Design a binder for this molecule. Sequence first.
Ligand code: UGA
Ligand code: UGA
Ligand code: MN
Ligand code: MN
Lengths: 245, 250
Amino acid sequence: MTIYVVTPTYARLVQKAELVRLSQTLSLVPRLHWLLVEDAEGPTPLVSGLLAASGLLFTHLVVLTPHPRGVEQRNKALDWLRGRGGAVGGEKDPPPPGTQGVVYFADDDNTYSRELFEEMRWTRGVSVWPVGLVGGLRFEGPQVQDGRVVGFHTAWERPFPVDMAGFAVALPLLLDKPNAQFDSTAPGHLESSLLSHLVDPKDLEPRAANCTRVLVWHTRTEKPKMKQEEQLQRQGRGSDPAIEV
Amino acid sequence: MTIYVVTPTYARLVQKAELVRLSQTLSLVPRLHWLLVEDAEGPTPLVSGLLAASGLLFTHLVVLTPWVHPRGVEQRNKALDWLRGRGGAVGGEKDPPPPGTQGVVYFADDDNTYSRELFEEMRWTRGVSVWPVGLVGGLRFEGPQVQDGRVVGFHTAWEPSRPFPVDMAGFAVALPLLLDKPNAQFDSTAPRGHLESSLLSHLVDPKDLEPRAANCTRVLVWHTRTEKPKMKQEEQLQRQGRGSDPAIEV
Ligand SMILES: O=C(O)[C@H]1O[C@H](OP(=O)(O)OP(=O)(O)OC[C@H]2O[C@@H](n3ccc(=O)[nH]c3=O)[C@H](O)[C@@H]2O)[C@H](O)[C@@H](O)[C@@H]1O
Ligand SMILES: O=C(O)[C@H]1O[C@H](OP(=O)(O)OP(=O)(O)OC[C@H]2O[C@@H](n3ccc(=O)[nH]c3=O)[C@H](O)[C@@H]2O)[C@H](O)[C@@H](O)[C@@H]1O
Ligand SMILES: [Mn+2]
Ligand SMILES: [Mn+2]
């Protein structure tokens, strides 16, 4: 079972760092295909280079978003999976029709345990699991009773009150529902805008030992202070722009 | 050449997430021994468990941190004490390499980002090696200026008085050198920013620094920091008696 990891990314100071640790984590997972989609005007040498040197099975996609982020990027990754092309690097050919697999939307700053991926390979339709440090809670996750989702441990308002990092979708189910995609105009409702097109919340498949284990965390990275850089810039002694960071 | 990675760590909401990605990055490096030092009263089930399941070669150490607010000093000096034969292991490999062993010591904080490439750069260190660190000291990257394969200055701005204006993540030290310099340790009384110099000054002169990472033109490590999680809702849910299940480790 191949896991297709859809990751939207964009240029900012910590981008490479984020992509370095994420790709390093992904290199630990077998049968994984990374669909990295840049939110840019064109492919950046930084991303293209990072990908070429990652040694991972990947497909490079690009699409600019002129409010929810990473939407147009994730939707383009979906278009590719549905055979509508759009690849600028890596494996240009999408999985053939009727190919088995599972799609997982992994943002570039979260922390993913390697165990997480083994949990989602068995996804029939859509599976769910708790996500740590998100929604203002220690963890947010499905309430399970006798192996069935009977509710959700959440504090914010949503038929699918789960974070992007808390679910995976079987590839066949996404191909069967050609219209299923994220709504770029959807506010906490991004995840639902996709899932509503696929399953009923009561049919979600709980993983992570019936949602008793946190295997992914919604970590965020601090924005680096650049006061000293600006100062050195004024003196014409800024950090060499030819040295990538 | 085995790399001994010294990492001080303490319990806080993001701790496990940090140790997870770090341990996952380290599992990518061969001949690496992780010296994970907990800032605690004793080994914690969280860290002990993570280490056991990591599959890494490690030694679990523990020491509590007793104005400038130096961080991880006691923990780092504890890993040094262990390397110097003073014991203190609570798990993993109990015995340190015997004198004469070839290796390199690297002080990796638990929140930075490390490319697997960085470790091959430091594996060959005779005395003290150096390279640029990204997003630290208020710069895109802070690092040594290299001319003719030798360090001839530093690209830095913050606390320029530092004889070694380089972040903890920007250098590595030869194990034999550390054992040969028993007094070499981190100074808890040093000004904010002079922590690195407090150790290195007992080991070498900046001119003898070994520039790595293509003569310090490649940034292979970043001083990333993780945002403290917002817990307003958790606080509210607790009062109602429905706080996040405490039996689920995060
Ligand atoms: O507001 C939102 O739409 C996002 O809110 C939260 O995530 P959060 O950590 O707040 O947001 P980011 O980490 O900044 O962005 C999520 C993903 O979109 C990407 N992104 C962000 C910003 C941007 O301008 N372009 C872009 O592609 C990021 O690289 C990342 O992979 C959810 O976990 C995301 O799934 C959701 O997309
Ligand atoms: O002020 C300092 O002493 C630190 O400043 C910067 O790092 P920074 O990212 O600001 O600090 P932290 O990441 O919070 O701490 C560095 C290490 O010490 C550990 N630490 C921190 C705080 C604490 O109470 N206990 C403890 O073990 C952290 O887990 C981490 O591995 C430098 O990169 C660190 O080497 C230096 O120790
Ligand atoms: Mn995020
Ligand atoms: Mn740090």
